[PDB]
Design a binder for this molecule. Structure first.
Ligand SMILES: O=C1C[C@@H](C(=O)O)NC(=O)N1
Ligand SMILES: O=C1C[C@@H](C(=O)O)NC(=O)N1
Ligand SMILES: [Zn+2]
Ligand SMILES: [Zn+2]
Ligand SMILES: [Zn+2]
Ligand SMILES: [Zn+2]
Ligand SMILES: [Zn+2]
Ligand SMILES: [Zn+2]
Ligand SMILES: [Zn+2]
Ligand SMILES: [Zn+2]
Lengths: 362, 362
């Protein structure tokens, strides 16, 4: 007996097109999404060229419309030069992404004043998300309060961060957050197995106490999001390993395993992979779209999942219970038992649908 | 220039059919909903007969399918005799409603043990909502914790109640709540104008400090819901006035006025009348459904709104800014500038749609 789920949404993926297509492209990354039970993805802007201006967004839209197999929205990225210049295209994006720490990106902001300028100029009704670790969470929350608007914190990874967000929510501040599966299911204890190259990720893997704190504070976590960050094995194990893990194909099986163990409920999962992504990002419904999972099937994660071009996974060897059997997208069978059945280009930009625009005052 | 909103959802209405159809019926109450920009309603079970058993639910389903002009779900009601008997029909309902205080209902529970029995027997994945005032909020929260599940608190009306819920959320407890417009826009100061009959409502109108506390704690309020509770003027002003206000036609204009004044944002409104109702009750999307509002139009609420059979309103004389111009439901024009254009029976039971079932473990 299969369980029917709505179409799940991952608000944090790196699909590497343009410019990094040996790592992933729209076609391979959205195949990975479908095989993970994900029917909508929000793609980050740290591509080559980065999606920091109208011409780059126009290019990315066409590459996505031609390559994506599931539906999508594209983030814009904040830069040191583009505040006040994105108003005409802002509403066509998933939101604005701020890179506030060191990671796999060149979108460097050198001053909190630049953060303030983005918060002041980006339309107030549209989402802002931030890569903000440790004290940077508190710093970006201050900027959000000074500018009287909301912020969403990407991949919360530490006890310190979840407790700070908890305290902010207790004060009624408009902050939401997401957590990635590696920060729930891996820790410092896995670094010996992974080694120092494969283990590179930002935020870094946390201690057992960090992991435990995230689980204990599940009520504070609004979304799960993979931070699917594919790089090839050669890159991960070479002389300058880039940070990041692939994760679209493993996220739902890991979480279903936790549901089966009673660590969270099916509802808790659906809030975090469907309803809260929709409401934070004003993402539209997908007609005739659903996912069928088999909660009884036990398997062990192999050395690489079938679709991501990363061709490796840090979850190798973990025993899971639960698998995606079938995905129906927009009335067509998109995935069945390892076979993707929709071509590149089947997916659409949800921000172009009338129901996908973010409502605003005239 | 009109603003397009998604189809709004009211999770707390009394449509009076069966058995009270001089007050309202499915056809008139759903006309009122559409004119208020509401495209989906969840109807309470305190009808005559009350919806407390499978035969009564079957009757109500047919009356709703024949009379409703917008989409709907029907609550079941808890009684002193039905715990453990609703399992086969529970999934077809909006949820289970517990009447835990004195109000317009006979669904009396005489012991907290009966509350526990309902929480133990009702399927754990399906919604439970409660009329629970003052200390009853804390009491039902205890029952929910003892039985390890969630609860939703109907029409929170007091500083005491919102602060208790705030404290429970700070402790990570699974509780949500809604607030009705009369508890945001009326107070003890209006009782002289209303008089003691018209002014009867449960929960009663609060003090200015209660109203202020609800606004100050907007972050704690998950939903707005009208508690549309129509009674005729003769009944309200006669020898034994029943409690309740009609409210479908006035709720959105009152809230749009507040948005225009900067008291909450358009997003805050859409979370509370669309996204959070969807996620708490697992209510499905409505295809090709939207509401167009004119945020500039100033008007004064008259002595009765056009559609509700109540034929009176406690908001008479209040100046508002914002009005519903057009509603499209399921691809058809349902309402335009005072004219309802879909017949009784156009609306459907969302729990019968494949996407409207609440997901559960096998
Ligand atoms: O912030 C980031 C971005 C990402 C990437 O590789 O794009 N990888 C990471 O590990 N952290
Ligand atoms: O709890 C309730 C129910 C309602 C009704 O009239 O049905 N009216 C009220 O004032 N309170
Ligand atoms: Zn396309
Ligand atoms: Zn990041
Ligand atoms: Zn990322
Ligand atoms: Zn929305
Ligand atoms: Zn019908
Ligand atoms: Zn009530
Ligand atoms: Zn009621
Ligand atoms: Zn749901």
């Amino acid at each position: 007996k299969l369980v029917r789920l709505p179409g799940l949404i991952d608000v944090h993926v790196h699909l590497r097109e343009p410019g990094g297509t040996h790592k992933e492209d729209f076609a391979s990354g959205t195949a990975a999404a479908l095989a993970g039970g994900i029917t909508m993805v929000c793609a980050m802007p740290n591509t080559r060229p980065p999606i920091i201006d109208a011409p780059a967004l126009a290019l990315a839209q066409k590459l996505a419309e031609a390559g994506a197999r599931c539906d999508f929205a594209l983030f814009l990225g904040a830069s040191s030069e583009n505040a006040g210049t994105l108003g005409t295209v802002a509403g066509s994006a998933a939101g604005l992404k701020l890179y506030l720490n060191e990671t796999f990106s060149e979108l460097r902001l050198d001053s909190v004043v630049q953060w303030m300028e983005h918060f002041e100029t980006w339309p107030s009704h549209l989402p802002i998300v931030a890569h903000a670790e440790q004290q940077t969470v508190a710093a970006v929350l201050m900027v959000a309060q000074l500018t009287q608007r909301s912020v969403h914190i990407c991949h919360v990874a530490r006890k310190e961060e979840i407790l700070l967000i908890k305290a902010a929510k207790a004060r009624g501040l408009p902050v939401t957050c997401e957590v990635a599966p590696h920060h729930l299911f891996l820790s410092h204890d896995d670094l010996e197995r992974l080694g120092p190259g494969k283990g590179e990720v930002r935020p870094e893997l946390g201690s057992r106490q960090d992991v435990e704190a995230l689980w204990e504070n599940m009520a504070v976590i609004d979304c799960f999001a993979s931070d699917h960050a594919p790089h090839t094995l050669e890159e991960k194990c070479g002389s300058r390993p880039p940070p990041g893990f692939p994760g679209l194909e493993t996220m739902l099986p890991l979480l279903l395993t936790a549901v089966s163990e009673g660590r969270l409920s099916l509802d808790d999962l659906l809030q975090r992979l469907h309803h809260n992504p929709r409401r934070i990002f004003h993402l539209p419904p997908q007609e005739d779209t659903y996912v069928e999972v088999d909660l009884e099937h036990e398997w062990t994660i192999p050395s690489h999942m079938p679709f991501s071009k990363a061709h490796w996974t840090p979850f190798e060897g973990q025993k899971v219970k639960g698998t995606v059997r079938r995905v129906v997208l927009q009335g067509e069978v998109a995935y069945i038992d390892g076979q993707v059945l929709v071509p590149p280009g089947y997916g659409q930009d949800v921000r172009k649908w009338p129901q996908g625009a973010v409502p605003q005052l005239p």
